[PDB]
Design a protein around this ligand. Structure first.
Ligand SMILES: Nc1ncnc2c1ncn2[C@@H]1O[C@H](COP(=O)(O)OP(=O)(O)OP(=O)(O)O)[C@@H](O)[C@H]1O
Ligand SMILES: [Ca+2]
Ligand SMILES: [Ca+2]
Ligand SMILES: [Ca+2]
Ligand SMILES: [Ca+2]
Ligand SMILES: [Ca+2]
Length: 901
DNA sequence: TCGTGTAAGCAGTCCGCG
DNA sequence: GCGGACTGCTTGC
């Protein structure tokens, strides 16, 4: 097999590399790597190295890495550019792995771990590590085993061994319900004292040294706690054994307000799953406790126990250990679904970076572009300092607030990357500038043609047409990967809809789910077999189809994010290729493209309808248009349609055979106008939306920019078994809106779009009547909580104190004197409830940590004093009034002359 | 919230508005 | 009460 790296580090003048050799074995080596950097040289000096602008360079070979770094400093002192890759480990990987890396994940040691620490005096701070580590569960991907280290004797209690037999039993048998599929994979090790536990853990770690290290909050809690606890008991040298090279660094992570410390373990790649989830999931959750996320992702019930976690070990050690094990398994289950580890490895090896660098698109693209340029003997420019400067972004059309009955939407495939490719936007393809006219002059095609030689953006920039820039070249490669995975995702989605239809008529039989590849549209033979299957088999197939769709989603959406991140990075001062000329070239072209195509679509539709000046495009944001299809339907007449699916077919055909060719013609003209390198503006139909045929549903509505709802029958070629709501911006989509309120608002919208005014009125009346019965957590608002200390004046709200911070201050007064009560953590999320006048808490609201029950000390009082009237008005009635007034509809029945009977 | 970009919505504070 | 200036938060692209 071809060799591949596992980890790489610079330690002084040495590269430390862990890698898989050609026989599939893990090895470690120290290499005295001699880096090269570059300086500009005279034209007369023969060379094969050139900078990205074609200026010749001399290569400078250094005796060591320190000499290279010192040379960079002196070049700054002199005032001359020091060219080349200044991150020497990236240069090392580029030299050592000069080929597309093919990796074998089965050879990569992926460790998932979690620790328990009993603490009687509050949260056990990792920087202090003053309490014993009393449990570690460490899953190893190569062994496929859960290694359990269990402390039986502690100053906080002596306990009996954990029982695997009780652990396996149902909760109803008094067991812990540790999943049967992992029972045989547990290796249980009890210990008489903490010193022996930790010494054995370190010996185990030496034998099975993680390459990828993950878990939940491991970077912020488990790793620093373990490091500091070992450091406190044994000293620094022993704690450094967590690093295969015995090197660690306390790393200070800084943000807008305050900073925190993590421990860098040289030769390990830490990918904290909470951070993977936050970057790659595209959710925004009210809470990030493992319980909360596991319930959301897997539909598993919360791990239930009695009393505080600080007393769980002494009261129920059995459950304490089982829950530690299950917690590790839950992360593995989430990854089996979301496949974020697989993604990180794919992207990391593609870029040739430390795997943990996948969190940084700037680092990722720096590596990709460096490797690409190096292939041609080209030399990357030195990074420079730039002041942060604002620049313009996208155009968003102001919609007329209204109901919109029939709607078809269209948007550009990978808009900004497509613009980069079309225009040929790259640091080294800049050809010059032209005299800019107002944007509307380009939009309306009255401005003079920018260039007869170069490819242009309406911000004034001109680009070479003879050759592709490195940015277009590399962005295309990742775009092509994205396209492949999106294909699999959409096929799985379409396959899912087939199964859902079949589920209307399940067969009374005993059978098996079909062995199929859900990434490809089901053949006719598979469809016929599906129509004969039982509900059990069909539901298992639906589950598998949906898991395939999720896998495709992860792969495609994060590749989309990477290429969009390149366009964004051009506007970040820390990017080697930062250039506001290029950043603005993209965004300004985008504004033109949207408004240009709005004009073209309006022109086309006025032509087919025989009208003048009519606005068919009702809305657009960045790269999208929403087209009113009422007149198209009305030209045929609703009476002529057999059912809903019939008019959906008709609009689908109209979009594909009439609209898209017209859009394409419009964009081809624009490409010629701007003299672009290649026509790549592909604006495909997204949604077909409308009310069910013969209903009183309104179909859709807009309240304003970035705020709308559509009843969708077909999305990017997926024809739904049941209509699906596309809701954007509205409160149903905001993590701040209470859970039960999101649900109620969604049903209100569903009724508006599908059933009509009278149906909406019936539901409103019932919700208003019953909502006080809802569980307090389900009706609590949510907010991130920053700057608690800033607004805290002697425990009371200072000037301009935000509402949610006021709530936290209220909470803090109510729990004062308790070391056991949960503390609100700066920067994390809180639930928030309004309080009625004259409550014992002395203020108008209270807040507590999200994803948790409020502490028993105050729960009963909070419940008694909760202001249901304010809650309802703020979270439900106000947004609903917004929806209904926009839609020209009433949520309460108005009086009429009929009432007199 | 360490980690690519901008546009833009709504909640709430403060305070003007005769 | 509603708006504007402002902070804070969050979402859509
Ligand atoms: N997270 C982001 N970071 C930077 N730019 C973004 C981001 N999301 C969207 N954009 C910009 O807005 C443009 C349009 O967004 P959109 O969500 O339609 O994605 P897209 O790149 O066009 O891909 P798709 O083919 O899925 O529509 C992007 O091309 C870019
Ligand atoms: Ca725990
Ligand atoms: Ca798009
Ligand atoms: Ca059937
Ligand atoms: Ca879009
Ligand atoms: Ca599309």
């Amino acid at each position: 097999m071809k060799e591949f790296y596992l980890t790489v580090e610079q330690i002084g003048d040495s590269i430390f590399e862990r890698y898989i050799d050609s026989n599939g074995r893990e090895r470690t080596r120290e290499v005295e790597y001699k880096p090269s950097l570059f300086a500009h040289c005279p034209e007369s000096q023969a060379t094969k190295y050139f900078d990205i602008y074609g200026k010749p360079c001399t290569r400078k070979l250094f005796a060591n890495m320190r000499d290279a770094s010192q040379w960079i400093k002196r070049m700054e002192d002199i005032g001359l550019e020091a060219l080349g890759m200044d991150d020497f480990k990236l240069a090392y990987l580029s030299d050592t792995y000069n080929y597309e890396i093919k990796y074998d994940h089965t050879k990569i040691r992926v460790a998932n771990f979690d620790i328990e620490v009993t603490s009687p005096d509050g949260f056990p701070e990792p920087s202090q590590a003053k309490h014993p580590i009393d449990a570690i569960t460490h899953y190893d991907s190569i062994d496929d085993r859960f290694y359990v280290f269990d402390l039986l004797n502690s100053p906080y209690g002596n306990v009996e061994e954990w029982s695997i037999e009780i652990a396996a039993k149902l909760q109803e048998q008094g067991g812990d319900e540790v999943p049967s599929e992992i029972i045989d994979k547990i290796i249980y090790m009890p210990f008489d004292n903490e010193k022996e536990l930790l010494m054995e853990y370190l010996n185990f770690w030496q034998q099975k040294t993680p390459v990828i290290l993950t878990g939940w909050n491991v970077e912020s809690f488990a790793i620093p706690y373990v490091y500091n606890r070992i450091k406190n008991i044994f000293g620094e040298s022993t704690a450094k054994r967590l690093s295969p090279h015995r090197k660690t660094r306390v790393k200070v992570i800084e943000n807008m307000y305050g900073s925190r410390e993590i421990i860098t373990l040289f030769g390990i790649s830490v990918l904290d799953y909470i951070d993977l989830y936050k970057k790659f999931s595209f959710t925004n959750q009210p809470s990030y406790s493992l319980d909360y996320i596991s319930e959301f992702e897997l539909n598993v019930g919360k791990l239930k126990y009695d009393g505080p976690i600080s007393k769980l070990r002494e009261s129920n050690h059995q459950r304490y250990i089982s829950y530690n094990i299950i917690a590790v398994y839950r992360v593995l289950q989430i990854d089996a679904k979301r496949q974020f580890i697989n993604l990180s490895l794919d992207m990391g090896y593609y870029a040739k970076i430390q795997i943990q660098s996948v969190f940084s698109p700037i680092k990722t693209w720096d590596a990709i572009i460096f490797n690409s340029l190096k292939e041609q003997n080209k030399v990357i420019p030195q990074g420079r300092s730039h002041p942060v400067q604002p620049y313009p972004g996208a155009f968003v059309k102001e919609p007329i607030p209204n109901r919109y009955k029939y709607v078809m939407s269209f948007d550009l495939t990978s808009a900004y990357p497509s613009i980069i490719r079309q225009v040929n936007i790259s640091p080294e393809t800049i050809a010059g500038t032209f005299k800019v006219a107002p944007l509307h002059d380009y939009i309306n095609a009255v401005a003079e043609r920018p260039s007869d030689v170069y490819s242009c953006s309406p911000n004034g920039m001109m680009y070479y047409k003879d050759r592709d820039g490195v940015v277009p070249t590399e962005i295309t490669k990742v775009f092509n990967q994205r396209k492949e995975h999106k294909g699999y995702m959409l096929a799985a989605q379409r396959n899912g809809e087939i199964i859902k239809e079949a589920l209307h008529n399940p067969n009374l039989s005993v059978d098996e789910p079909l062995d199929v590849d859900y990434r490809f549209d089901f053949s006719d033979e598979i469809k016929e077999k599906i129509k004969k299957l039982s509900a059990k088999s069909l539901n298992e197939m639906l589950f598998r189809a949906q898991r395939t769709e999720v896998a495709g989603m992860t792969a495609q959406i994060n590749r989309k994010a990477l290429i969009n991140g390149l366009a964004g990075a051009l506007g970040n001062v820390w990017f080697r290729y930062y250039d506001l000329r290029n950043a603005t070239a993209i965004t300004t072209f985008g504004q033109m493209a949207l408004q240009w195509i709005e004009r073209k679509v309006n022109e086309y539709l006025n032509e087919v309808c025989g009208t003048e000046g009519e606005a068919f495009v009702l809305y657009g944001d960045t790269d999208s248009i929403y087209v009113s299809a009422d007149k198209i339907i009305d030209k045929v007449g609703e009476s002529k349609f057999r059912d809903t699916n019939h008019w959906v077919d008709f609009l689908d055909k109209f979009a594909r055979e009439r609209m898209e060719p017209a859009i394409d013609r419009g964009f081809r003209e624009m490409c010629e106008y701007m003299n672009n390198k290649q026509h790549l503006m592909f604006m495909d139909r997204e949604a077909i939306a409308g009310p069910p045929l013969g209903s009183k549903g309104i179909g859709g509505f807009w309240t304003g920019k970035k705020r709308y709802a559509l009843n969708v029958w077909d999305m990017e070629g997926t024809r739904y078994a049941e209509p699906k709501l596309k809701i954007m911006g509205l409160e149903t989509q905001k993590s701040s809106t209470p859970k039960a309120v999101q649900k109620a608002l969604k049903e209100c919208i569903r009724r508006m779009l599908q059933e009509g005014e009278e149906s909406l009125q019936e539901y409103f009346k019932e919700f208003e009547k019953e909502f006080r019965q809802l569980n307090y957590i389900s009706i609590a608002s949510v907010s991130s909580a920053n700057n608690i200390a800033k607004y805290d004046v002697g425990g009371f709200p200072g000037p301009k104190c935000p509402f949610h911070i006021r709530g936290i201050l209220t909470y803090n007064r109510a729990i004062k004197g308790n070391i056991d009560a949960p503390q609100v953590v700066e920067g994390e999320k809180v639930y928030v409830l309004p309080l009625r006048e004259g409550n014992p808490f002395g203020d108008k609201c209270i807040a507590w940590p999200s994803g948790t029950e409020i502490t028993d000390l105050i729960k009963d009082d909070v419940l008694h004093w909760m202001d249901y009237t304010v809650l309802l008005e703020k979270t439900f009635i106000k947004p609903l009034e917004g929806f209904t007034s926009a839609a020209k509809l009433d949520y309460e029945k108005k009086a009429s002359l009929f009432d007199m009977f």
